[PDB]
Specification:
With 67 residues, the protein is mainly beta. The protein has one domain: SH3 Domains (SH3 type barrels, Roll), CATH 2.30.30.40. Helix content is 0%, strand content 40%. Strands 4-3-2-1-5 form a five-stranded antiparallel beta sheet, with no helix packed on it. β3 and β4 form a beta hairpin. It starts with 6 loop residues before the first strand and ends with a strand. Bound molecules: chloride ion and sodium ion (NA).
Length: 67
């Protein structure tokens, strides 16, 4: 994201969320990383969209971590 504290990732695999709170995406989408919320999940959002939620770290290539 534009906020320099956010991170940046590119989806590495498709991800379908298990429920609403999990954010689905496809490989190749750029994702803003808001927070690494635990040892396995990020909170993030997709630029240009209203898509936002959590997803597992496994499913992205992290380019820049959030601060
Ligand atoms: Cl869930
Ligand atoms: Na899933």
């Amino acid at each position: 994201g534009i906020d320099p504290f956010t991170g940046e990732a590119i989806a590495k695999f498709n991800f379908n969320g298990d429920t609403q709170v999990e954010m689905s995406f496809r490989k190749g989408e750029r994702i803003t990383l808001l927070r690494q919320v635990d040892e396995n999940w990020y909170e993030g959002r997709i630029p240009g969209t209203s898509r936002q939620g959590i997803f597992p770290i496994t499913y992205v290539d992290v380019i820049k971590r959030p601060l």
